[PDB]
């Protein structure tokens, strides 16, 4: 029943791609883990490949991860780490299934490089909050890197 719903809903539907991340998935992910896993699953299975790639590119880049990992608490950092682990695991399985080879190679590697740069930058700061946050986030994400 839910998939039937999401079918017509997806038939129905950058400004939206901005506000969606702003007030719908970032607030949801910083909650308990289940909300993060659910934001991950609903990011897929609810959009087309073009709009999905555009949304993920707008989230990964634009330099939001660096500060947003400074602001949040410890457990909020853990949750956001779980969300990134899920999205990257699914992306890497999609790649290693050969489905995306035309230009997704360069874009995927660019995403990996930008995330690596952001983490390497935030992991190097004098405060205590940034250090503990980065440590927890990597302790979650390093399982699939």
């Amino acid at each position: 029943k839910t998939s039937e719903f999401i079918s017509e809903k997806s038939n129905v539907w950058e400004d939206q791609i901005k506000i969606f991340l702003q007030n719908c998935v970032v607030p949801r992910v910083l909650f308990s883990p289940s909300d993060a896993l659910f934001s991950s699953f609903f990011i897929f299975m609810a959009f087309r490949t073009e709009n999905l790639m555009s949304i993920l590119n707008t989230c990964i880049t634009s330099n939001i991860l660096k500060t947003l990992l400074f602001c949040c608490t410890s457990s909020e950092a853990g949750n956001l780490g779980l969300f990134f682990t899920d999205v990257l695991k699914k992306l890497e399985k999609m790649r290693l299934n050969g489905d995306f080879n035309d230009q997704a190679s360069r874009k995927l590697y660019e995403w990996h490089s930008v995330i690596t740069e952001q983490v390497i930058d935030l992991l190097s700061e004098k405060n205590y909050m940034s250090i503990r946050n980065g440590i927890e986030f990597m302790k979650h994400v390093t399982s699939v890197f």
Partner: protein
């Protein structure tokens, strides 16, 4: 008797909060960021381990 003289009721818990908008002139940055995470998230690259760039 004192701790039983405190007024308890739904009318007192309202304590209305402060609107998200924050006017423009390491804990203060933390609080201001926690409060601004909802309204203007994408205007966050300017922080960069420094004073809030307005």
């Amino acid at each position: 008797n004192n701790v039983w003289k405190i007024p308890t009721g739904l009318d007192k818990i309202e304590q209305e909060v402060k609107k998200p908008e924050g006017v423009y002139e390491i804990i203060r940055q933390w609080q201001t960021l926690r409060f601004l995470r909802s309204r203007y998230l994408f205007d966050f690259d300017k922080v960069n381990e420094k004073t809030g760039v307005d």
